[PDB]
């Protein structure tokens, strides 16, 4: 026990040293130097599409790089690919397991990924010579439910799971290439950088970590929130990111300052966050809530600029097009809507 | 003119053919009932599902599945055994099930409080409201001999047992001992007390006594699903 106590003392000393190092750099606060800029409080928008046809509640959706086609997942056991402009259905894939909770769309548009409560990630080929969508690969090795996945290219993909780990895969061989093993609680969100050199994740231990894809190691950790984290997103320029939690607050972190520098909250909000996203320029921050309403935040002044209403059950997913022309949201009422 | 042709191909071929299959699948989805099975490792829930499968899919990876049919109605039952210790996130995937099956080892006095706490937590969760529960007290045969042996007492775990008295609604079996009935109904009332306290009119619980060698368990679930669906249909037509 003496050695364990000694190691605990060393950990405490290093924690104190890091906290002291952080405080030295806090010369100014963002709210005190962005005080003189203009507000953007005129934001108001209306829904003008409604995609209908899912039988059960929706968990995940993702935009294509052309910003016209998108995919969605529902726990009735279907993946539907939609055409946003005409609202026509172009594909419908029945899944082996009904308890899906994530999906992704390849940047090249040739493949889609899927997975969930069966601890497996499945890859589907959308352009085979026969003209029929068919399963092409299954990835196994996680010991917990799959929670998120994002393509790097046609041949490799990154994933996070409830077993407290993340992995990098080679689709051709089907083998894990790297494993990330720092978090203490369940991991259920990840975000790729614009250059795909590094990525960030958040877990149930109320902390986030920065990972190096090639070196396979962590070099930063953030501890602002005070409860479970379930959403995360990068800033457009890649120097910051935003986080959402069930303590009913959002926070912004800076990679280079290594510190928290903004919080978004209001007294009359008690529900938790479920989604986060940024507009094309980064001035606006959009987030979904368990009150099935969505608030638009002035990310640079910290005020609310608007609200999106029209769903009648928990808002589950949220996404912005690659060119910033529209925003799509899903909900547990089994409908999906496009705004502005 | 090619734009018109592409629009025609899309709207005619893809959308209508997809919608036809979706309409076909909707009936099959609506005609089936899906259930969630919960319990500790010492309970005999696996014995229950195997026994009622013998009365009449397979494999397991993250989840285990079971099929059974009674009066030409299909039931699907799921057992989430591939996950680790914490429940609070994957539990809310089942907000849409018709009912939850809860199994308890009645003969284990030491572990009864843990099951009671789990039942309370499940009952009072935000996303698990409005869902009824079927409660099974599983090991009456062991409880009978444990009580009649007298070596281990109940009041050392539940001191309120000394003041308990059997209710007038008790229906003992013909050969049962009165004190076995007393302990058995006390254990049942422990769960019913939590159930009736915060339970609103939209939420009900159905207790049962069962044993390892038992064959009516399939029909009981059918009879309880009957009652809750009947209440739902009464509610929609403003009759409740």
């Amino acid at each position: 026990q003496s050695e364990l106590d000694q190691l605990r003392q060393e950990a405490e000393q290093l924690k104190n040293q890091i906290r002291d190092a952080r405080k030295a750099c806090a010369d100014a606060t963002l709210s005190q130097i962005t005080n003189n800029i203009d507000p953007v409080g005129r934001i108001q928008m209306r829904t003008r599409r409604t995609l209908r046809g899912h039988l059960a509640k929706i968990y995940a959706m993702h935009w294509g790089t052309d910003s016209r086609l998108l995919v969605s997942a529902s726990q009735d056991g279907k993946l539907i690919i939609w055409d946003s402009y005409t609202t026509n259905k172009v594909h419908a894939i029945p899944l082996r397991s009904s308890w899906v909770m994530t999906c992704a769309y390849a940047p090249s548009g040739n493949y889609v990924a899927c997975g969930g409560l069966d601890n497996i990630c499945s890859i589907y080929n959308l352009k085979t010579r026969e003209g029929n969508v068919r399963v092409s690969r299954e990835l196994a090795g996680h010991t917990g439910y799959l929670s998120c996945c994002r393509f790097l290219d046609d041949n490799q993909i990154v994933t996070s799971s409830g077993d407290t780990t993340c992995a990098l895969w080679d689709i051709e061989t089907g083998q894990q290439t790297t494993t990330f093993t720092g978090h203490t609680g369940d991991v259920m969100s990840l975000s790729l950088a614009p250059d795909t050199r590094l990525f960030v994740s958040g877990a149930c231990d109320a902390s986030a970590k920065l990972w190096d894809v090639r070196e396979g190691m962590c070099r930063q950790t953030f501890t602002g929130h005070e409860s479970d984290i379930n959403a995360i997103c990068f800033f457009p320029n890649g120097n910051a990111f935003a986080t959402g939690s069930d303590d009913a607050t959002c926070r912004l972190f800076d990679l280079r300052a290594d510190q928290e520098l903004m919080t978004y909250s209001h007294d009359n909000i008690i529900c938790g966050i479920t989604s986060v996203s940024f507009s094309k320029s980064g001035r606006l921050l959009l987030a979904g809530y368990d009150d099935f309403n969505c608030n638009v935040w002035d990310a640079l002044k910290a005020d609310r600029a608007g609200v999106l209403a029209g769903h009648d059950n928990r808002v589950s997913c949220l996404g912005v097009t690659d060119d910033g022309m529209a925003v799509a949201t899903g909900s547990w009422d089994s409908f999906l809507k496009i705004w502005n | 003119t090619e734009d018109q042709r592409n629009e025609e191909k899309a709207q005619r071929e893809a959308n209508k053919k997809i919608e036809k299959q979706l309409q076909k699948d909707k009936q099959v989805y609506r005609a089936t009932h899906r259930l969630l099975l919960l319990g500790a490792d010492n309970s005999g829930k696996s014995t229950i599902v195997k026994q009622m499968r013998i009365l009449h899919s397979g494999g397991t990876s993250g989840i285990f599945e079971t099929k059974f049919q009674v009066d030409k109605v299909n039931f699907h039952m799921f057992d989430v055994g591939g996950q680790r210790d914490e429940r609070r996130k994957w539990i809310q995937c089942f907000n849409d099930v018709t009912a939850i099956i809860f199994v308890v080892d009645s003969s284990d006095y030491n572990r009864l409080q843990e099951a009671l706490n789990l039942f309370k937590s499940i009952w009072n969760n935000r996303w698990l409201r409005t869902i009824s529960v079927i409660l099974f007290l599983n090991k009456q045969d062991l409880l009978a001999e444990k009580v009649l042996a007298g070596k281990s007492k109940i009041e050392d775990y539940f001191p309120e047992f000394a003041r308990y008295t059997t209710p007038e609604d008790a229906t003992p079996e013909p050969g049962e001992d009165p004190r076995v009935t007393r302990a058995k109904y006390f254990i049942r009332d422990e769960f019913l007390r939590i159930s009736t306290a915060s339970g609103d009119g939209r939420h009900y619980c159905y207790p049962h006594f069962t044993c390892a060698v038992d064959t009516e368990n399939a029909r009981r679930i059918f009879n309880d699903c009957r009652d809750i669906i009947q209440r739902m249909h009464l509610r929609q037509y403003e009759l409740l």
Epitope: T184, G185, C204, D205, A206, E226, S227, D228, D246, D247, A248, I270 | D85, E86, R87, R88, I91, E114, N117, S121, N124, N125, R126
Partner: nanobody
Framework: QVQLQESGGGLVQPGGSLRLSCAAS????????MNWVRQAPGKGLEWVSD????????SYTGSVKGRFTISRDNAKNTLYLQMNSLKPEDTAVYYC?????????????????????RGQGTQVTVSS
């Protein structure tokens, strides 16, 4: 940084008295519910007691009713446990835990292994 630090404990004779203290920081203490949990030698974690946000609706396990008492002090962010007439089987390590959400009645995973929002623990021994 959420952290909990227990205090008190030590050795006591059978029939003796003792009390524990728990200090919390890094979150709004007045919003959450609090718990006491212990682990005896060669056994898993076990339920003891809890207390709500305002200090009403207290509950105990049947093994310690009439002997143990729980209380809060919201103005100081501290939690107490008063123990009287201790018995030999009370020897265990006692932890300070809080339920995961700020306004709910749910306390699913407080007794789970490797739970996040729990302290390090203190040793209590009863012997002749």
């Amino acid at each position: 940084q959420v952290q909990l630090q227990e205090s008190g404990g030590g050795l006591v004779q059978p029939g003796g008295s003792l009390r524990l203290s728990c200090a919390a920081s890094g979150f709004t203490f007045s919003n959450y519910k609090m718990n006491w949990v212990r682990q005896a030698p060669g056994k898993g974690l076990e339920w003891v007691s809890d207390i709500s946000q305002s200090g009403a609706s207290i509950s105990y396990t049947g093994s310690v009713k009439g002997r143990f008492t729980i209380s809060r002090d919201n103005a100081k962010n501290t939690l107490y446990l008063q123990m009287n007439s201790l018995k030999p089987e009370d020897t265990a390590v006692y932890y300070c835990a809080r339920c995961p959400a700020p306004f709910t009645r749910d306390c699913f995973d407080v007794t789970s292994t490797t739970y996040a929002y729990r302290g390090q623990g203190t040793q209590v021994t009863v012997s002749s």
